[PDB]
Amino acid sequence: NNAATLCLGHHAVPNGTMVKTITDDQIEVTNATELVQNSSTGKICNNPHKILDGRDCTLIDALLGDPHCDVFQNETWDLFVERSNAFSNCYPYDVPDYASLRSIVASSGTLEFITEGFTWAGVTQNGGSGACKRGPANSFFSRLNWLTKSGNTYPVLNVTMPNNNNFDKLYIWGVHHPSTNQEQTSLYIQASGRVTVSTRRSQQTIIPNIGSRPLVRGQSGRISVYWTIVKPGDILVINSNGNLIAPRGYFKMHIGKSSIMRSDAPIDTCISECITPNGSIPNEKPFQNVNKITYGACPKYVKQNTLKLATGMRNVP
Amino acid sequence: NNAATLCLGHHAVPNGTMVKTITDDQIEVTNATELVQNSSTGKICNNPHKILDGRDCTLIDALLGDPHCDVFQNETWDLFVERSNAFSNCYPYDVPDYASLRSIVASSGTLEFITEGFTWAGVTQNGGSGACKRGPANSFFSRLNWLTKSGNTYPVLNVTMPNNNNFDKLYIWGVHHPSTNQEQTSLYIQASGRVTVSTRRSQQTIIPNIGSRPLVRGQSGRISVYWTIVKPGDILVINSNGNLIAPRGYFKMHIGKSSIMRSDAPIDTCISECITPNGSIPNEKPFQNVNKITYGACPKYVKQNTLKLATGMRNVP
Amino acid sequence: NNAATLCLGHHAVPNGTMVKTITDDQIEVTNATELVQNSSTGKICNNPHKILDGRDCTLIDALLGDPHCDVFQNETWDLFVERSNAFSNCYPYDVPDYASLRSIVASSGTLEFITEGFTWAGVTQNGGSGACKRGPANSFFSRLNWLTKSGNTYPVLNVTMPNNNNFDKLYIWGVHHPSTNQEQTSLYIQASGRVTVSTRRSQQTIIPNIGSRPLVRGQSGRISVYWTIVKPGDILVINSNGNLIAPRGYFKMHIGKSSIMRSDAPIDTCISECITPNGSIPNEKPFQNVNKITYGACPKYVKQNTLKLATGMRNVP
Amino acid sequence: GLFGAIAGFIENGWEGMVDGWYGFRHQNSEGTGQAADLKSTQAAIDQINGKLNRVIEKTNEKFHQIEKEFSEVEGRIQDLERYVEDTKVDLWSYNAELLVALENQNTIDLTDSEMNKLFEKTRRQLRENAEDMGNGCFKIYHKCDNACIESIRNGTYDHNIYRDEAVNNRFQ
Amino acid sequence: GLFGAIAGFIENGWEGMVDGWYGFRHQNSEGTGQAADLKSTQAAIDQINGKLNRVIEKTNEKFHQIEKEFSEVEGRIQDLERYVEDTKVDLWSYNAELLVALENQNTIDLTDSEMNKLFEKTRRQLRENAEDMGNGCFKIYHKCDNACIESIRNGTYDHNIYRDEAVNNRFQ
Amino acid sequence: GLFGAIAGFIENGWEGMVDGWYGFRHQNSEGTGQAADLKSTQAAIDQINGKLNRVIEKTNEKFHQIEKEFSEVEGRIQDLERYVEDTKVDLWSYNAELLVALENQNTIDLTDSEMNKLFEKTRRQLRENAEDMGNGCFKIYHKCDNACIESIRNGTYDHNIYRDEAVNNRFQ
């Protein structure tokens, strides 16, 4: 009682955590926190982003109008989810530079289609085929128009369609490559067609290529698909003496936050800013280990499955 | 006076600055300094880099020799400034892979053109047109040579031009696509031309493509432009039975610090290492917020409009 | 002896090192260590990676089967070393998109070639040429098959070859562009051939292009080369009325760590994980200044030739 | 740690103290006790919270980017796409390794500071009336009861009052 | 700060001192004064200047690069061009955020060091002839005039001379 | 350095000491000597070794990448290939500049800590039996021979034993 004892010190815990610093690979601490997000509920939340489930359709087939993708006409998305099990079921086709066509449409975020009064003088419109049925009936891509002969002549088509709009127009069209010359002439009279779509500033010319391809839905011909963008104040001009697969109109182009992702995750009602092909994820942590592919407000992909930040002092029990 | 008092301390200021550290979002300090450059005088200094104002001309039209770009023949630049208001005023054309042709010439840093004695036997040289006038008179790209028929025949052209130089030669040429067959034959006699420019190591063959394109300076045909590089010791061989738009010579290629920028900034007499499309900027600060596009010795573009580094201690008034 | 003197202190050295910190550009220290590797023995160690010396052959010529590259048939590599002094010595050729053909084969890591019973009905196989000799005798690329006429007709070839394998098949083929029409018909009867190789999902059609090219090993025609990949369960279909240079089979495709490097370094028996074109290097240091091009487990290329990390305290002699 | 207080001259931490990060355990005439110290316990909990996203953004928000997986081999262009990603991932993976290692060294250092600054705010108050035992406790050399301790803890303690008596019990 | 001198035990800074960063304000028999201390004021002004481009290059000089704005949509290749830039800009934008935050923590720490090292070069000179008041001032326990102070400041002060007299005024 | 021990109050380093990084040079009745101190010499050699690849990976292993040199001019695509590399190299070149500058500041600081923590483990043992000379040596105020020193060095020294005699030789 003529002396006392005052002691200074710090708290501690029974079970504390190990972290790393510039000077220990491991060192014990009182609290810690995980910076890497490494799991996913496995579902894709349908908010705040507008998700569009493609189901049995790829964006290009929805674009073109494979009859079994008619439900997707004029649709829109912030995010297009393409499904591994999707198939085509129309006349067989290829897209020189498919990856790009896909990208640009995905980014536009809309399939809004405006029909335009194309005058196709001296030819038959609305060709159909056995590869592309509507129930029992013969059909074709909704957004395209197969021009065949009329009488025993196919004249030289020469049409135009100015853009008096304040947005860009995406025109999609194609060229038919027949398998045997019987077919070339049975449809287009001429010996070897040609398709030349142009603007003031650009052009593309395509000669067909007769010959046999592996057989698909009873067909060994092919349609090759091409696109032309037409800027406000520019003009479009289609010019062909056979084999033109013609457009019926144009797609509105948009600028914005729109994209496309491949995933088999199911769509849920919930809220999540960050989306991965593996499903949505919380975006509270600065990092994530779930997928380098993402969409929205998302942590940064890194390689590590765990990183622990010290939220407290050194721990000595 | 049997004791004294000694005090140690530090300076301070009335109005000091706020900065950020690893441990305060804000904390007061005595002096500070801004690391991000966020403004521009708005002019492009014509030193120490050689600036070349394209004015009413794009680098390709200067290249090709649109009559209104004749002042730019044999010119050179460290930096080519392309102007938003530039136009073309010659026969209408396109350049498959324009972006690249543009890039490679911009990097070469010269339009030095060497004329070569091409022998073009059995044909008419110096074709001109109503789209490409020199005052009241009919004309054409200065660096190209429109070969038409002579008599009632166009023979098969077969010429060559070895490179006995120690630099690469850039050959520019084109192919004419006529609109109606009247024109195909009215000029080249044959039914459908062909152009095949080649080296020991590469080749390009172009068939024309008859058909109508939107009308431009009274013309609905088009010239497509192509380039061939010919290395020292390699040879060039041009071979065509119609539609060749021929070169008159070659462009010297260089290696060096040369480039091209799009900007509407005016050119000034002053000194500045760093150039942006927004005008020049001082390069004393390590960072800059003016433009991700730059040329010269420049700070690093970042997103932040301000970053303050502490040049003094903590400030307590 | 009624007092003592205890002294605390630190070690030092006669010649210590200079390093840099956040607060001195230079400051003396007791030991230091170099983090940048800046030299190379100059040899490429043949372990643990399988090195394959191409010698007088480029990977594409080895691929195609230039007679002087026959030793490389069915070979494999982790690393293909291509030599600056390599040459070709067969019929002259080009590869649209050579860089890519080269890359994909280099990555596959094998030239394993499987011959397949192609039936080529109504034509002559095993064409040879004066550009591509086997000793005194006339020859051709080992992996390709020059189809010429038989009788005074060349029929329309239409063949197929399904993939019932669980790996991808790489088919290589080409198209011959003759110089004069004498040759077109002297070999393929028709006036202008055509080659159309296809799968279920893709196709390529190539029209030849008659005309003269610079002369090479007594030839001014050219073969253009193309590849088709055929996935398991897909089918291949070749369809041509002249000018087809046919495949004899396919190359097995692999997935793995395989690549290709250009270097003139000699191959040694030793062990080194890291390889550069300049020769191998030790990978103990985190950085390296020898070459941005590397292969294997390698330090990170940086610009600096030296960086010194302090392994000891400050040094005051 | 850099000052060598925590796990340094102080052997140990008090697994009871569910009221604070720092504080005092006294032993006198009346008995003992234990009380939090909020002024330097707040100074760590304010430094450790404003240290998290002092350096990372409001979570960058990205939209349409490049494709990062492929069904088909393609060569040069896909080589470049893959390398662009691979290159970025390794740089963020390093940045986040180093971020943590630096933050963790600093967290651990700023706490070892906060302890050894409480000890020398206190050692300065008790002036010459007591001694640094060398274990983080001072030996007070006078009668010090429940309002004498509490006057230290709340930083108003008057050293003059006990100055003579404490030089007494000390050297006599 | 890490040592807790500046804005720590020292309440305040002297808005007059237009002659230095550190120094002394004395109060004795003759009156008072104030003088800069150049040796530790230079030690901060040399650490803070050689800390700027100890780490950034001689301003990297770039020439023809890739295009970074576009008139026309194009798809895959332009996707890749844009992503390459976007990717770089976000990495430099982080690097420069972190650069500053680290430099600023260090600047602030190296100054709080320089103050508390002047205090313990000085406390070591005055030895036992004076006492740490706990506010950054010592109380000198002897007659100390304009050349007695100046002998401290220029680090030649002889403590033996005043040793007995100063133990006197102290404990008697 | 941040505490100002090494190259600070201590003038110098002992170019003989081929047995350790820290330690003691004593001067008494019997003569003198010099001995390593392993406990704080190990504490630097463990901090400096686990600081190297605490932050760098198990050397990343790469395989087929993009081509980085070119025989022929090509334009847009090769512009992009070159820029992708150039961009990466400048980022790793910065990362490795900064890595070292930070590690080196820290190495130098953690050692200046380890010295000044040996001095205040020791100053705390000798308690009041001796004085801080201000040059890193204490003056012991009692008979201290080869097992009296060795009891300090091995941290078992009992200060009570010499307490009175040492207050004697000190103030009388």
Side-chain angles (χ1 to χ4, degrees):
Chain A
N1 68 331
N2 293 347
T5 264
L6 188 56
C7 292
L8 296 85
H10 51 76
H11 69 164
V13 286
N15 279 322
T17 300
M18 302 297 278
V19 305
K20 179 193 289 137
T21 67
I22 299 293
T23 58
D24 276 51
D25 1 327
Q26 270 197 354
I27 192 157
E28 201 176 1
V29 290
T30 69
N31 198 24
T33 187
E34 173 59 77
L35 307 189
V36 178
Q37 178 72 6
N38 62 50
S39 73
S40 156
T41 53
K43 344 158 156 292
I44 287 159
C45 289
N46 69 352
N47 255 310
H49 306 292
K50 185 172 173 198
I51 309 314
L52 174 60
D53 190 336
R55 294 166 190 284
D56 286 345
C57 290
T58 61
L59 172 52
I60 300 301
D61 290 314
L63 184 73
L64 295 185
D66 204 309
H68 78 114
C69 298
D70 285 335
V71 74
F72 293 106
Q73 300 204 321
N74 287 12
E75 265 295 334
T76 67
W77 61 90
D78 292 321
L79 194 55
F80 200 107
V81 183
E82 235 166 9
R83 299 300 188 183
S84 66
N85 65 23
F87 56 86
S88 296
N89 191 35
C90 193
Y91 199 95
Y93 73 97
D94 68 287
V95 179
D97 216 348
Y98 183 97
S100 309
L101 181 57
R102 180 166 161 288
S103 154
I104 82 180
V105 174
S107 207
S108 185
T110 177
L111 284 171
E112 178 167 358
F113 187 74
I114 303 317
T115 304
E116 287 197 310
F118 278 102
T119 289
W120 297 119
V123 285
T124 321
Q125 306 185 31
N126 318 279
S129 159
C132 193
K133 281 207 180 74
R134 273 186 210 271
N138 275 11
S139 162
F140 200 57
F141 301 106
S142 17
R143 308 307 198 185
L144 294 161
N145 180 5
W146 201 335
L147 308 183
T148 34
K149 75 178 137 227
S150 176
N152 41 93
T153 307
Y154 187 104
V156 174
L157 304 168
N158 188 54
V159 305
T160 126
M161 190 75 58
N163 182 359
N164 296 285
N165 277 299
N166 83 346
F167 49 77
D168 292 349
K169 296 171 166 177
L170 170 60
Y171 280 98
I172 289 168
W173 47 275
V175 181
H176 179 203
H177 309 275
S179 38
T180 62
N181 305 314
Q182 158 71 276
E183 214 197 337
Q184 172 71 67
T185 63
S186 173
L187 300 156
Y188 316 120
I189 300 294
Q190 275 64 252
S192 70
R194 151 194 70 77
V195 180
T196 302
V197 173
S198 32
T199 55
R200 263 195 269 116
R201 30 174 314 280
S202 80
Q203 34 138 19
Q204 301 150 259
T205 297
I206 302 304
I207 319 299
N209 298 128
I210 304 157
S212 310
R213 288 89 175 175
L215 199 87
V216 172
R217 293 167 283 283
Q219 301 295 331
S220 48
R222 293 285 185 274
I223 291 167
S224 271
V225 176
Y226 303 84
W227 73 95
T228 308
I229 294 196
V230 179
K231 292 171 161 299
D234 217 315
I235 309 174
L236 184 73
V237 177
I238 305 182
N239 179 270
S240 173
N241 69 1
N243 305 51
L244 163 71
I245 281 171
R248 308 191 165 278
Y250 65 80
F251 295 78
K252 275 204 66 160
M253 308 211 74
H254 285 220
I255 295 189
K257 56 171 252 210
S258 263
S259 188
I260 184 167
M261 178 175 274
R262 284 168 191 115
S263 150
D264 282 341
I267 303 304
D268 206 12
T269 318
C270 37
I271 294 170
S272 185
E273 292 291 341
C274 192
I275 301 176
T276 81
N278 316 88
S280 301
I281 65 174
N283 58 349
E284 309 176 318
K285 306 197 170 53
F287 309 117
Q288 64 96 9
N289 178 229
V290 173
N291 200 331
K292 61 206 195 271
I293 293 159
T294 87
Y295 181 82
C298 287
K300 298 177 168 59
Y301 180 90
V302 298
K303 276 180 286 177
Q304 302 93 359
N305 56 323
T306 177
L307 291 173
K308 287 181 192 76
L309 186 80
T311 62
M313 74 167 71
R314 168 163 188 169
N315 185 59
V316 208
Chain B
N1 67 331
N2 293 347
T5 264
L6 188 56
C7 293
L8 296 85
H10 51 75
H11 69 164
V13 286
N15 280 322
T17 300
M18 301 297 278
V19 305
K20 179 193 289 137
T21 67
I22 298 293
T23 59
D24 276 51
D25 1 328
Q26 270 198 353
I27 192 157
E28 201 176 1
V29 290
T30 69
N31 198 24
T33 187
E34 173 59 78
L35 307 190
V36 178
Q37 179 71 8
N38 62 49
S39 73
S40 156
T41 53
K43 344 157 157 292
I44 286 159
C45 289
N46 68 352
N47 256 311
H49 306 291
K50 186 172 174 199
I51 309 313
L52 175 60
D53 190 336
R55 294 166 190 284
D56 285 346
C57 291
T58 61
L59 173 52
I60 301 302
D61 290 313
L63 184 72
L64 295 184
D66 204 310
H68 79 114
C69 298
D70 285 335
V71 74
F72 293 106
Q73 300 204 321
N74 287 13
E75 266 295 334
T76 67
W77 61 90
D78 292 320
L79 193 56
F80 200 107
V81 184
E82 236 165 10
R83 299 300 187 183
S84 67
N85 66 23
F87 56 86
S88 297
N89 192 36
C90 194
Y91 199 94
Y93 72 98
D94 68 287
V95 179
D97 217 348
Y98 183 97
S100 308
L101 182 56
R102 181 165 161 287
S103 154
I104 82 180
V105 174
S107 208
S108 185
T110 177
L111 285 171
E112 178 167 357
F113 187 75
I114 303 316
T115 303
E116 287 197 310
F118 277 101
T119 290
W120 297 119
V123 285
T124 321
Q125 306 185 30
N126 318 281
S129 158
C132 193
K133 281 207 180 74
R134 273 186 210 271
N138 275 10
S139 162
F140 200 58
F141 300 106
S142 17
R143 308 308 198 185
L144 294 162
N145 179 7
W146 201 335
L147 308 183
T148 34
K149 75 179 137 227
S150 177
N152 41 93
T153 306
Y154 187 104
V156 173
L157 304 168
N158 189 52
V159 305
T160 126
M161 191 75 58
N163 182 359
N164 296 284
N165 278 298
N166 84 342
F167 49 76
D168 292 349
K169 296 171 166 177
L170 169 60
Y171 280 99
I172 289 168
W173 47 276
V175 181
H176 179 203
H177 309 274
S179 38
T180 62
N181 304 315
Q182 157 71 277
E183 215 197 338
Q184 172 71 66
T185 64
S186 174
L187 300 156
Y188 316 120
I189 300 294
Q190 275 64 251
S192 70
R194 151 194 70 76
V195 180
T196 302
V197 174
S198 32
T199 56
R200 262 195 269 116
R201 31 174 314 281
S202 80
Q203 35 139 19
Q204 301 150 259
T205 297
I206 301 304
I207 318 299
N209 299 128
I210 304 157
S212 310
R213 289 89 176 177
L215 199 87
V216 172
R217 293 167 284 284
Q219 301 294 331
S220 48
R222 292 285 185 273
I223 290 167
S224 271
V225 176
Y226 301 84
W227 72 96
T228 308
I229 293 196
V230 179
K231 292 171 161 299
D234 216 316
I235 308 174
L236 185 73
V237 177
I238 305 182
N239 179 269
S240 173
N241 69 1
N243 305 51
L244 163 71
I245 281 171
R248 308 191 165 277
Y250 65 80
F251 295 78
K252 275 204 66 160
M253 308 211 74
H254 284 219
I255 295 189
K257 56 171 251 210
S258 263
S259 189
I260 184 169
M261 179 175 274
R262 284 168 190 114
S263 151
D264 283 341
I267 303 304
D268 205 12
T269 319
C270 37
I271 293 170
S272 185
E273 292 291 341
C274 192
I275 302 175
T276 82
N278 316 88
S280 302
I281 65 173
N283 59 347
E284 309 177 317
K285 305 197 170 53
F287 309 117
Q288 65 95 11
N289 178 229
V290 173
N291 200 330
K292 62 206 195 271
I293 293 159
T294 86
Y295 181 82
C298 287
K300 298 178 168 59
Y301 181 89
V302 298
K303 277 179 286 177
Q304 302 92 0
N305 56 324
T306 178
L307 292 174
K308 286 180 192 76
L309 188 79
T311 62
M313 74 167 71
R314 168 163 187 168
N315 185 60
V316 208
Chain C
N1 68 330
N2 293 348
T5 264
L6 188 56
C7 292
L8 296 85
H10 52 75
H11 69 163
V13 286
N15 278 321
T17 300
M18 301 297 278
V19 305
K20 178 193 289 137
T21 67
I22 299 293
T23 58
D24 276 51
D25 2 327
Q26 270 198 354
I27 192 157
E28 201 176 1
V29 290
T30 69
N31 198 23
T33 187
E34 173 59 77
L35 307 190
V36 178
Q37 178 72 7
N38 62 49
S39 74
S40 156
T41 53
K43 344 157 157 292
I44 287 159
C45 289
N46 68 352
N47 256 310
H49 306 291
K50 185 172 174 198
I51 309 313
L52 175 60
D53 192 335
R55 295 166 190 285
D56 286 346
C57 290
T58 60
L59 172 52
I60 300 302
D61 291 313
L63 184 73
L64 295 185
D66 204 310
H68 79 114
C69 297
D70 286 335
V71 74
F72 293 105
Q73 300 204 321
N74 287 13
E75 267 295 333
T76 68
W77 61 89
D78 293 320
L79 193 55
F80 200 107
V81 184
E82 236 165 9
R83 299 299 188 183
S84 65
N85 65 24
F87 56 86
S88 296
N89 191 36
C90 193
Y91 198 94
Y93 73 97
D94 68 287
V95 179
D97 217 348
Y98 183 98
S100 308
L101 182 58
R102 182 166 160 287
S103 154
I104 83 180
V105 174
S107 206
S108 184
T110 177
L111 284 170
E112 178 167 357
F113 187 75
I114 304 317
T115 304
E116 286 197 310
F118 278 101
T119 290
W120 298 119
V123 285
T124 321
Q125 306 184 31
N126 318 280
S129 158
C132 194
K133 281 207 181 74
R134 273 186 210 272
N138 275 9
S139 162
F140 200 58
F141 300 106
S142 16
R143 308 308 198 185
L144 294 162
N145 180 4
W146 202 335
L147 308 183
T148 34
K149 75 179 137 227
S150 177
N152 41 93
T153 307
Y154 187 104
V156 174
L157 304 168
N158 189 51
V159 305
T160 127
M161 191 75 57
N163 182 359
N164 296 285
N165 277 298
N166 83 344
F167 49 77
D168 292 351
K169 295 170 167 178
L170 169 61
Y171 281 98
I172 289 168
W173 47 275
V175 181
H176 179 203
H177 309 274
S179 39
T180 62
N181 304 314
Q182 158 71 276
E183 215 197 337
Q184 172 71 67
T185 64
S186 173
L187 300 156
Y188 316 120
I189 300 294
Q190 275 64 252
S192 71
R194 151 194 70 76
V195 180
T196 302
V197 174
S198 32
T199 55
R200 262 195 269 116
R201 30 174 314 281
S202 80
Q203 36 137 22
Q204 301 151 260
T205 297
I206 301 304
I207 318 299
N209 298 129
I210 304 157
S212 310
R213 288 89 176 176
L215 199 87
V216 172
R217 293 167 283 284
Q219 301 294 331
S220 49
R222 292 285 185 274
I223 290 167
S224 271
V225 176
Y226 302 84
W227 73 95
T228 308
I229 293 195
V230 179
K231 293 171 160 299
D234 215 316
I235 308 175
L236 185 73
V237 177
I238 305 182
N239 179 269
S240 173
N241 69 2
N243 305 51
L244 163 71
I245 281 171
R248 308 191 165 279
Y250 65 80
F251 295 79
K252 275 204 66 160
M253 308 211 74
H254 284 221
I255 295 189
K257 56 171 251 210
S258 263
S259 188
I260 184 169
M261 178 175 274
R262 284 167 191 115
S263 150
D264 284 340
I267 304 304
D268 205 12
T269 318
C270 37
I271 294 170
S272 185
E273 292 292 340
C274 192
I275 302 175
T276 81
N278 317 88
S280 302
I281 65 173
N283 59 348
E284 310 175 318
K285 305 197 171 52
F287 308 116
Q288 64 95 10
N289 178 229
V290 173
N291 199 331
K292 61 206 195 271
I293 293 159
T294 87
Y295 181 83
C298 287
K300 299 177 168 59
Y301 180 90
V302 298
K303 276 179 286 177
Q304 302 92 1
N305 56 323
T306 177
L307 292 174
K308 287 180 192 76
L309 187 79
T311 62
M313 74 167 71
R314 168 163 187 168
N315 185 60
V316 208
Chain D
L2 285 179
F3 308 93
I6 295 165
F9 57 64
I10 298 176
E11 304 295 323
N12 227 294
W14 308 324
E15 310 198 7
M17 194 171 240
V18 189
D19 59 329
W21 283 30
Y22 310 107
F24 305 95
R25 272 195 160 183
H26 62 254
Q27 302 186 357
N28 63 349
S29 180
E30 304 186 34
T32 71
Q34 183 187 275
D37 171 26
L38 272 269
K39 222 179 67 63
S40 78
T41 269
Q42 196 60 15
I45 301 196
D46 276 8
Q47 270 176 109
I48 265 177
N49 290 25
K51 71 135 58 153
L52 317 148
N53 48 326
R54 272 197 227 294
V55 187
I56 303 277
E57 249 185 40
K58 317 202 84 193
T59 293
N60 63 178
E61 161 156 56
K62 310 300 190 185
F63 290 114
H64 192 58
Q65 316 166 46
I66 64 161
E67 306 289 326
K68 315 210 175 137
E69 293 181 27
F70 311 85
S71 292
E72 296 81 29
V73 190
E74 307 172 52
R76 172 165 197 189
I77 174 75
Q78 182 183 125
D79 290 351
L80 181 57
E81 279 164 339
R82 297 184 122 93
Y83 187 79
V84 161
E85 192 62 24
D86 198 75
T87 295
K88 171 196 191 155
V89 176
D90 294 1
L91 283 167
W92 282 111
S93 290
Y94 163 98
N95 286 20
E97 202 69 66
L98 177 68
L99 184 44
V100 163
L102 294 173
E103 284 291 10
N104 291 1
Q105 190 74 14
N106 194 64
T107 282
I108 270 176
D109 291 342
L110 73 91
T111 55
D112 186 324
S113 186
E114 284 304 277
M115 176 83 286
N116 190 95
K117 282 189 300 198
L118 188 58
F119 188 83
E120 319 278 72
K121 175 184 194 269
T122 293
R123 187 190 58 75
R124 279 179 177 86
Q125 255 200 145
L126 293 174
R127 287 285 308 269
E128 291 282 318
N129 310 7
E131 286 204 343
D132 189 349
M133 287 180 65
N135 69 331
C137 308
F138 300 96
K139 193 179 177 189
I140 298 171
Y141 282 99
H142 59 81
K143 189 175 160 62
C144 197
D145 49 10
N146 296 15
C148 168
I149 293 290
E150 174 57 29
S151 86
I152 300 159
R153 302 200 302 207
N154 68 41
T156 39
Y157 164 99
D158 199 290
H159 82 119
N160 289 325
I161 292 293
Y162 310 89
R163 183 148 193 93
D164 302 298
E165 179 184 347
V167 190
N168 256 22
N169 291 345
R170 274 186 80 190
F171 305 96
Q172 284 99 40
Chain E
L2 285 179
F3 308 93
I6 295 165
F9 57 64
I10 298 176
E11 305 295 323
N12 227 295
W14 308 324
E15 311 197 8
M17 194 170 240
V18 189
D19 59 329
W21 283 30
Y22 310 107
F24 306 95
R25 272 194 159 183
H26 63 254
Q27 302 186 357
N28 63 349
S29 180
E30 304 186 35
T32 72
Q34 183 187 275
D37 171 26
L38 272 269
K39 222 179 67 63
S40 78
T41 269
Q42 196 60 15
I45 301 196
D46 276 9
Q47 270 176 109
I48 265 177
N49 290 25
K51 71 135 58 153
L52 317 148
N53 48 327
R54 272 197 226 294
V55 187
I56 303 276
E57 249 184 40
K58 317 202 84 193
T59 293
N60 64 177
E61 161 155 56
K62 310 300 190 184
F63 290 115
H64 193 59
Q65 316 165 47
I66 65 161
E67 307 289 326
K68 315 209 176 137
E69 293 181 27
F70 311 86
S71 292
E72 296 82 28
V73 191
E74 307 172 52
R76 171 165 198 189
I77 174 74
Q78 183 183 123
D79 289 352
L80 182 58
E81 279 164 339
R82 297 183 122 93
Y83 186 79
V84 162
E85 191 62 24
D86 198 76
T87 295
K88 170 197 191 155
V89 175
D90 295 1
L91 283 167
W92 282 111
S93 291
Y94 163 97
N95 285 22
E97 202 69 67
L98 176 68
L99 184 44
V100 163
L102 294 173
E103 284 290 11
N104 291 0
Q105 190 74 14
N106 194 63
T107 282
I108 269 176
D109 291 342
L110 73 90
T111 55
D112 186 324
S113 186
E114 284 304 277
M115 176 83 286
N116 190 95
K117 283 189 300 198
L118 188 58
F119 188 83
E120 319 278 72
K121 175 185 194 269
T122 293
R123 187 190 58 75
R124 279 179 177 86
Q125 256 200 145
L126 293 174
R127 287 286 308 270
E128 291 282 318
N129 310 7
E131 286 204 342
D132 189 349
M133 287 180 66
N135 69 331
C137 307
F138 300 96
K139 193 179 177 189
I140 298 171
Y141 282 99
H142 59 81
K143 189 175 160 62
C144 197
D145 49 10
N146 296 14
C148 168
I149 293 290
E150 173 57 29
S151 86
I152 300 159
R153 302 200 302 207
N154 68 41
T156 39
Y157 164 100
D158 199 290
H159 82 119
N160 288 326
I161 293 293
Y162 310 89
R163 183 148 193 93
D164 302 298
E165 179 184 347
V167 190
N168 255 23
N169 291 345
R170 274 186 79 190
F171 305 96
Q172 284 99 40
Chain F
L2 285 179
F3 308 93
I6 295 165
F9 57 64
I10 298 176
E11 305 296 323
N12 226 294
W14 308 325
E15 311 197 8
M17 195 170 240
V18 189
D19 59 329
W21 283 30
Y22 310 107
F24 305 94
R25 272 195 160 183
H26 63 253
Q27 302 187 357
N28 62 349
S29 180
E30 304 186 35
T32 71
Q34 183 187 276
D37 171 27
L38 272 268
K39 222 178 67 63
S40 78
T41 269
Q42 196 60 16
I45 302 196
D46 276 8
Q47 270 176 109
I48 265 178
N49 291 24
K51 71 135 58 153
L52 316 148
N53 48 326
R54 272 197 227 294
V55 187
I56 303 277
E57 249 185 40
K58 317 202 84 193
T59 293
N60 64 177
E61 162 155 56
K62 310 300 190 185
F63 290 114
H64 193 59
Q65 316 166 47
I66 64 161
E67 306 289 324
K68 315 210 175 137
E69 294 182 26
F70 310 84
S71 293
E72 296 82 28
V73 190
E74 306 172 52
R76 172 165 197 190
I77 174 74
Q78 182 184 125
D79 289 352
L80 181 58
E81 279 164 338
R82 298 184 122 93
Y83 186 79
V84 162
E85 191 62 24
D86 197 75
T87 296
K88 170 198 191 154
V89 175
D90 294 1
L91 283 167
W92 281 110
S93 291
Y94 163 98
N95 286 17
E97 201 70 67
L98 177 67
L99 183 44
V100 163
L102 294 173
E103 283 290 10
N104 291 359
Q105 191 73 14
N106 194 63
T107 282
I108 270 176
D109 291 341
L110 73 91
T111 55
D112 186 324
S113 186
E114 284 304 277
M115 176 83 286
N116 190 95
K117 283 189 300 198
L118 188 58
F119 188 83
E120 319 278 71
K121 175 184 194 269
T122 293
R123 187 190 59 75
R124 279 179 177 86
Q125 255 200 145
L126 293 174
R127 286 286 308 270
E128 291 282 318
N129 310 7
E131 286 203 343
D132 189 349
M133 287 180 65
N135 69 330
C137 308
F138 300 96
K139 193 179 177 189
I140 298 171
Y141 282 99
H142 59 81
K143 190 175 160 62
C144 197
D145 48 10
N146 296 15
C148 168
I149 293 290
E150 174 56 29
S151 86
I152 300 159
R153 302 200 302 207
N154 68 41
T156 39
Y157 164 99
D158 199 290
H159 82 119
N160 289 325
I161 293 293
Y162 310 89
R163 183 148 193 93
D164 302 298
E165 179 184 347
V167 190
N168 255 24
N169 291 345
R170 274 186 80 190
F171 304 95
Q172 283 99 40

